[PDB]
Every structure is written in C-alpha cells, then in structure tokens.
C-alpha cells in the first residue's frame, strides 16, 4: 500500500472544476480504504499461519503422550 | 429480445478517450445482457418444467395404489 463570458459558460467551467475535485477526493478516500484493506489482509495471513500451527499442535499434543507410551509399552 | 499547446491537445484527446471508453463499456454490457436474457429464458422454461414434474412424479408414485384402494 474573444471574450465570450456568459452565465452558461461559467457554469460549465466551474462544474468541470467541481468534477475534477470530486474524483480527487474520491481517490483520496479510496486510498485510505485500501490501507485498512491491506491491514486486514496482513492479519489474515498471520492468523492463517497461526491457526494451521495450532491445528498441528493440537493434533499432536493431545495424542502424543499415549501414542509414545503405547510404542514403548 | 492557433492554440496547439500540448495541454489543450491532450485535453481534447482525453475527452475523446473518455467517450470511446464509455462506448466500449456499453458494447460489452450489451452482449453480457444477451447472455443474461438467455439464462432468464432458460429459467422461465425450467420453472414450468420442474413444477410439472413435481406434480406428475408425485401422482405417478401414489395414484397407482390410491386408485387400486378406491376400486377395492
């Protein structure tokens, strides 16, 4: 992560400026949204690794002692 | 079912590009909507087909014995 100033031309010019500033603010807000999205993706990756590790650890440690004891006796 | 500044020429080309972009989007949407129409037609046919089969199979399962019991 010539001078043709007229009440309808000025509206068009001002509205074109408004359109540009509108998509400027939209781009800024969108980028601020992708920042949080990147954050959520990073926690997704970290917790994927953590949860697979805990799944392996729970599949092992619950059954480890009684399996090695049966291997020995 | 004569004002040849680069900025002005770039603005002209950008407006043209905007129009061609929206045209291409409309052209893609038309064929997407054609496929949607085909799927909608298939759903209208299959609704009637499935309700008909729902009635017909139930009747075929049960009437063969219910009519025999009515005759008995």
């Amino acid at each position: 992560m010539p001078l043709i100033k007229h009440p309808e031309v000025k509206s068009a010019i001002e509205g074109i400026k408004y359109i540009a500033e509108t998509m400027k603010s939209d781009q800024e807000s969108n980028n601020a949204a992708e920042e949080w999205k990147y954050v959520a993706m990073v926690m997704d990756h970290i917790l994927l690794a953590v949860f697979m590790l805990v799944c392996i650890i729970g599949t092992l440690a619950v059954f480890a002692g009684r399996l090695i004891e049966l291997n020995q006796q | 079912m004569l004002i040849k500044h680069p900025e002005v020429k770039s603005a002209i080309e950008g407006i043209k590009y905007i129009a061609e972009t929206m045209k291409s989007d409309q052209e893609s949407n038309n064929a997407a909507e054609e496929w949607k129409y085909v799927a909608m037609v298939m759903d209208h046919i299959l609704l009637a087909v499935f309700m008909l089969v729902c009635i017909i199979g139930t009747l075929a399962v049960f009437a063969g014995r219910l009519i025999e019991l009515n005759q008995q």
Binding site: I13, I16, K17, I19, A20, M23, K24, Q27 | E7, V8, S10, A11, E13, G14, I15, Y17, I18, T21
Partner: peptide, 23 residues
Amino acid sequence: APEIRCCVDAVNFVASSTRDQEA
C-alpha cells in the same frame, strides 16, 4: 487565459483517472 488553463488541467486529470481505472 488562466481560466482556460485551469479547466484544461482539470480535463487532463479526469482523463488520467479513467486511464488509471482501465489499467
């Protein structure tokens, strides 16, 4: 003339935004 330059820059900006979204 400055008023024309400002709207020219605005039009260029809204063209570049569309090019960004198409990439």
